[PDB]
Amino acid sequence: MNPIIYTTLIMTVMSGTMLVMISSHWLLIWIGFEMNLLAMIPVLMKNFNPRATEAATKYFLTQATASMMLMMAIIINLLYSGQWTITKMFNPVAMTMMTMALAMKLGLSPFHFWVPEVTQGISLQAGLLLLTWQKLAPLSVLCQISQSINPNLMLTMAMLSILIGGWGGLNQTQLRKIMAYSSIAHMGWMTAVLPYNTTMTILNLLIYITMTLAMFMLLIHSSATTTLSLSHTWNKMPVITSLMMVTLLSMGGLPPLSGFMPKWMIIQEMTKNESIIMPTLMAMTALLNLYFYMRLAYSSSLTMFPSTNNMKMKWQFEHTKQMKLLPTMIVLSTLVLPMTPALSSLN
Amino acid sequence: PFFDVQKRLGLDLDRWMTIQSAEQPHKIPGRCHAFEKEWIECAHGIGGIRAEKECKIEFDDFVECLLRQKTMKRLSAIKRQRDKLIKEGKYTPPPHHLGKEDPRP
Amino acid sequence: TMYIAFILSTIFVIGFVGFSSKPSPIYGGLGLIVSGGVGCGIVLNFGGSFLGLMVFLIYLGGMLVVFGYTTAMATEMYPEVWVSNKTVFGAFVSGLMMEFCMVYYALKEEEVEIIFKFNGLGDWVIYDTGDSGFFSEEAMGIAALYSYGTWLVIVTGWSLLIGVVVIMEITRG
Amino acid sequence: PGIVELPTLEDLKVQEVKVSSSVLKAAAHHYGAQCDKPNKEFMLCRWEEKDPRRCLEEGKLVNQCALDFFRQIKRHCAEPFTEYWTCIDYSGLQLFRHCRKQQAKFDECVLDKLGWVRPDLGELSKVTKVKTDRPLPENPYHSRARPEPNPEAEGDLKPAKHGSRLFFWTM
Amino acid sequence: AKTLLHKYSDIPEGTECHRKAYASTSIGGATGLIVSAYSIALKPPASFLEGVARTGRYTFTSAAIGAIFGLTSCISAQVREKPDDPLNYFIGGCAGGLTLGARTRSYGIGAAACAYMGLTAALVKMGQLEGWQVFAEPKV
Amino acid sequence: TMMSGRPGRVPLQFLPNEARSLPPPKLTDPRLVYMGFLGYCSGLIDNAIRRRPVVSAGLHRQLLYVTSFVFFGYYLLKRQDYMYALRDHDMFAYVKSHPEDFPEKDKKTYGEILEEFHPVR
Amino acid sequence: MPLVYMNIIMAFAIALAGLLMYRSHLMSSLLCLEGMMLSLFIMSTLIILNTHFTLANMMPIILLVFAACEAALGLSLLVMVSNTYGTDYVQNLNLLQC
Amino acid sequence: MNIMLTLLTNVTLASLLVLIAFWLPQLNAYSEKTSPYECGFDPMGSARLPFSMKFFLVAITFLLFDLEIALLLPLPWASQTNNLKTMLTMALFLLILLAASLAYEWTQKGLEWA
Structure with a gap:
């Protein structure tokens, strides 16, 4: 793929997300979703492999079904209200259909099945975009319609998502699948607090x-996609695996690391609304995610695995590609807990 | 995150098609322009929570105009009763309803 | 003839069942052809001459490229029809039975609530008594795309160009 | 709700203008100029009352003036007008450009016998002022009372009492 | 859904044990049908008869668990004359777990299911008595 | 969504003009110092990843890290203080305008109130 | 609602069920996608025409445009699967598990 | 309803011609006559085997070109607006984008076959 063409496709994905997050018309939100899918498929298939084609096909099918359901919900809401604005949806059936569509776009269980497969099929570069940037638009749409969301359906989807993510992450040795289940x-976790407080989301x-x-x-x-391949990174670059262990501990939600902030604030908001069983169950189920993160930390840094002889040549060379945002992202994801009262800026 | 850049920069990208009471080419009114105008002017600025319960009569009138569910129910009841009366011969449709009188221009 | 739209909608559902049972894509093609033509008929009956002719024209052209592929990719030594596989025939019969049951329930019982509330009266009732004058209101509203909908034009054009680019990038190996 | 008030059959009875569309189109240009005053009042009524039952009396005056318009034609320009609208009636589009020869005959007689002058291009489409005496409707939409708006802001801002009161954070 | 829930809850504790057991059986059967449908979708049976057998087994297991739970809870409430004690629901849940173990033919499964189910049923009874909200309406 | 729908809120505005009535955070604020500490840690990790002397290599780069972190932290803290002040102001105004919902309670001293004594035997 | 609305919604539901229930070919799934798009077009068009929402008469055309864009996407993915596997059978998409 | 009458008459006439064609002549059929025609010799493979399209990209792009033609159809009515500047700019924008897509496909060797 030509770098100019790749930049245009990435900018088209970003413009689709910005159209979703910027418009006030349902038709334009659906248009932004369509543009996101159209520009995301080739980005998924930048490196041509049969696995990449399979991932692109599965992602396209799932997102197409979700977009069709979303447009049906929009049409029904227009029929029963004569309104296109992103506001309190005036039909319960349309609200349910839209919720199902948006959960399918986000990958909330039981619409989770495509995420581990599409994430594994695509490269790390595409997997990062899929698991980070592709969550912005549906979450923004959900935050705009949080008032009309049926709390029972969203809470059931959130709890099932947490349970299934933890359970799926335990049987995975491929790093991309572990990341998908953690996602x-x-x-x-994010969608649990949507009916209560969107700023926590x-x-x-x-x-x-x-x-x-x-x-x-x-x-x-580290150019690692499996636990065994990542294990060798302790020999060439111990700093990378140590930082990975710290970030995994943060992802587990262990204080004083930054990963404790979202769970803590979510439990706070859900207890403010007299919900005590759901946050307790969510906190207890986070232990499975913490388990597989810890297992990875063992295999990567906490314990040292056998390397290969050819790493001696790799010892001489230094990495050429430089990701300028990596130190800042590591710091912000590990040492920002003393800065929670900054929550107000998100209001 | 509804980044309302339209209200910030003053641009009008899609607010012109959000409602049928907005300006339309050749001033072609919507079928329920009056009801939607009343509902919007009633529920302007008071917030969604208040608008749901306070300006509920206006919204009900707007929905009835849009879908005509209750009007169709009344018409169906009238039709059913007329058919039942005709079956028993208790009623005779007037000539102007039987296509016997010339309709006024 | 007071229920022309209802008959056309029933044929629409029949065609949707026909291409939803998944026969050979060739036969799914004519199923979608019938559905699109009957939908064009419905839209014409509701006053949407341009819109109905537009769906008719586009889908007619689109299903042609699908047919080209059915003979290139989805070509089975023995292409299957609605009466070739008990699975396909079962799906077709189930769809027809569902449609017939719902039609009967809607007709004989005036007010029917399956998921939404449907009224058994003819579709002619909901029509308006207004006069559009020297206008084709649908045509004027559609033509307002280039005057009012500049943003829509921009986004759609960009999406079409990016679609061409995406097709070329996908089909390159 | 309530009972929809409907005017009786008697009070909406007028002497109808029993002419054809072709006849109306032939005399339309002169009709607009001569019957301008009562037609414009009725249009203003319909577009201010927004209720057909509040302008029946003005609607009756439209037909009365329309009938009076044709009565003068029958008395001074009967035959030339009949030639004009018969030509127009033939074409399916009821075009004006296929009967200009007959139009000149009708205009010439009308200009002499009755003194009417056909309005020029772009004159029947102008927006006019109508001087009426019926009061301007106060609530044409029959709108309810607008709900009271929420209380609007307050004076100047002061810092939070003890900063962010979030658990153990003192600032 | 809520129709069956109110067909079971509206029946007062320790009264109409047959109808309470029937309502619990219906709830269990619905849950088993849902589980059977999901199992068929995710883990396809080889034949239609195999799918019918799998659905029947799952539905019968779930319905038996529900019926035993309802009967045990209502009988405990009747005999002990304590309608508002979670021990009744604990006994019912343990009986349901024992029936689950019997259907699966495993003593360890039976004991574990008895323990966990009894605890969960006692928790449900406590939540009903106190007013615990699994899905709390947004109030802030 | 609480503060999102406040009347008069200008979209995509980081600091409203009304925020200037509040005292700016001091340049010696502990939160600002922690932002600088985060910037310094980011610089150290950047040195560590690129395999250069962690505490000495690239003083300009670490200085830029600290400066950017302090700058953004100062603006972020100012916005946070403004938002908390807005919350307190709105709460006080709502309490003042709704006396019935927040009535003063009778002040009974412990000599009057009867709290049951639970012995520890 | 009028019975035509019921019929069109039922057609959309049937097409959705068909798409969700694959049999062998990926072409038939794209057919069900196009059918759902057509049903949504008809629904939106009837709604707009009935309510005389003049300025919204351009919405179905945009829907159709993005519909055939998705169709082209599907067709391109179909050719790649056929090139990589010889058939468009949905069972060949099996490398990615869980 | 007149268009429906015309369609019905045409379809009935065509089907009547088919009926007369299939029931007037004297029919004598046997296996060899109804065998597929392959220029006098027996065919090797089935005619329902895959037939590769060397112009698949052309068809997939013809999809989007038909879309653009659908977008361009309302133009005769669009010229009746008062905002002729904006209307003309948007129409030329759509045409320029169509030309740009065609040019991109042409230069990147998309219109070529095989």
């Missing part, structure tokens, strides 16, 4: 985006 769990989204950017950029800097 599913974190999306459930925004905070969780920002923290998750920083953590996933750090993790994916570390994986790219």
Whole structure:
């Protein structure tokens, strides 16, 4: 792919997301979603492999179904209200259909099945975009219609997402699949507080985006896609695997790391609304995510695995590609807990 | 995150097609222009929470204009009763309703 | 003839069942052809001459390229029809039975609520008594795309160009 | 709700203008100039009352003046007008450009016998002032009372009492 | 959904044990049908008869669990004359877990299911008595 | 969404003009110092990743890290203080305008109130 | 609502069910996608025409444009699968699991 | 309803011609006559085997070109607006984008076959 063409496709994805987050008309939100899908498919297939084609096809099918359901919901809302503005949806059936469509776009379980497959099929560069940038538009739409969202359906989807993400992450040895299941769990965490307080959803989204950017950029800097391949990184570059262990501990939600901020604030907001069983269950189920993160930390840094002889040649050379945002993303994802009262700026 | 750049920069990208009461080419009014105008002017600035319960009569009139569900129900009841009366011969449709009188211009 | 739209909509559902049962894509093509033509008929009956002719024209052209591919990619030594596989025939029969049951329930029982509330009266009732004058209101509203909908034109054009680019990038290996 | 008030069959009875569309189109240009005053009042009524039942009396005066318009034609320009609208009636589009020869005959007689002058191009489409005496409707939409707006802001800002009161944060 | 929930809850504790057991059986059967449908979708049976057998097994297991839970809870409420004690629901849940173990033919599964189910049923009874909200309406 | 729909809120404005009535955060603020510390840690990690002397290499780069972090932290803290002041102001105004919902309670001293004594035996 | 609305919504539902229930070919799934798009077009068009929402008469055309854009996307993905596997069978998409 | 009458008459006439064609002549059919025609010899493979399209990209782009033609159809009515400047700029914008897409496909060797 020509670099100019790749830049145009990336800018088209970003422009689709900005159209979704900027318009006041439902038709333009659907248009932005369509542009996002159109410009995302070739970005998924930048490196041509049968696995890449399979991932692109599955993603296209899922997003197409979700967009069709979303447009049907929009049309029904127009029929029962004569309105196109992004506001309190005036039909419960349309609200349910739109919720299902947006959950399918986000990958909330039981619409989670495509995420581990599409994430594994595509490269790390495309996986980062899929797991970070592709969550902005549906979350923004959900935040704009949080008033009309049926709390029961959203809470059930969030709890199922957390449970399924934790369970799926335990049986995975491919790093991309582990990241996909962690993303599913974190999306459930974000959508748990949508009916209660959207600013907490925004905070969780920002923290998750920083953590996933750090993790994916570390994986790219190590060129590792499996636990065994990542294990060798302790020999060539111990700093990368140590930072990866710290970021995994942060993702587990362990204080004083930044990953404690979203869970803590979410539990606070959900207890303010007299919901005590759901946040407790979510906190207890986060232990599975913490488990597979810890297992990875063992295989990567906490314990040293056997390397190969050819790493001696690799010792001499230094990395050429330089990701300028990696140190900032690592710092913001590990040492920002003393800065929670900054929550107000998101209001 | 509804980044309302339209209200900030003053641009009008899609607010011209959000409602049928907005300006339309050749001033072609919407079928429910009056009802939507009343509903919008009633519920302007008071917030969505208040608008749902306070300006509810206007919204109900707007919905009835849009879908005519209750009007169709009344017409169906009238038709059913007329058919039942005709079956029993208790009613005779007038000539102007039987296509016997010339309709006024 | 007071229920022409209802008959056309039933044929629409029949065609949707026809190409939803998944026969050979060739036969799904004519299923979609019938559905599109009947939908054009419905839109014409509701006053949307340009819109109905537009769906008719576009889908007619689109299904042609699908047919080209059906003979290039989805070509089975023995292409299957609605009476070739018990799965396809079962899906077709189930769709027809569902449509017939809902039609019967809607007709004999005036007010029907399956998911929404449907009224059994003819579609002619909802029509308006207004006069458009020397206008084709649908045509004027559609032509307002270049005057009012400049943003829509820009976004659609950009999406079409990016679509061409995406097609070329995808089909390059 | 309430009972829709409807005018009785008697009070909406007028002497109808029993002419054809072709006949109306032939005399339309002169009709607009001569019957301008009552037609414009009725249009203003309909576009201010927004209720057909509040302008029936003005609608009756439209037909009365329309009938009086044709009565003068029958008395001074009967035959030339009949030639004019018969030509127009033939064409399916009821075009004006296929009967200019007959139009000149009708205009010439009308200019002499009755003194009417056909309005020029772009004169029947101008927006006019109508001087009426019926009061301007106060609530044409029959709108309810607008709900009271929420209380609007307050004076100057002061810092939060003890900063962000978020758990253990003292600032 | 809520129709069956109110067909079961509206029946007072320790009264009409047959109808309470029937309502619990209906709830269990609905849950088992949902589980069977999901299992068929995700793990396709080889034959239609195999799918019918799988659906029947799952539905019968779930319905038996629900019926046993309802009967045990109502009988405990009747005999002990304590309608508002979570121990009744604990006994019902343990009985349901024992029936689950019997259907799966495993003592360990039976014991674990008895324990967890009894705890969950006691928690449900406590939430009903106190007013705990699993899905709390947004109030802030 | 609370503060999103406040009347008079200008979209995509980081600091409203009414925020200037509040005292700016001091340049010796502990939060600002922590922002500078985060910038310094970012610089150290940048040195560590690129395999250069962590505490000495690229003083200009670490200085830029610290300056950018302090700058953005100062503006962020100013916005946070403004938002908390807005919250307190709105709460006080709502309490003042709704006396019935927040009534003063009878002040009974402990000598009057009867709180049950639970012995520890 | 009028019965035509019911019929069109039912057609959309049937097309959605068809798309969700694959059998062998990926072409038929794209057919169900196009059918859903057509049903949505008809629904929106009837709604706009009935309510005389003049300025919204351009919405179905935009919907159709993005519909055939998605169709072209699907067709290109279909050719790539056929080039990579020889058939458009949906079972060949099996490398990516879980 | 007149268009429906015309369609019905045309379809009935065509089907009547088919009926007369299939029931007037004397029919004598046997296996060899109804066999597929392959210029006198027996065909090797089935005619329902895959037939590769060397112009697939051309068809997929003809999809979007038909879309653009659908977008351009309302132009005769669009010239009746008072905002002729904006209307003309938008129409020329759509045409320029169509030309640009055609040029991109042409230069990147998309219109070529195989």
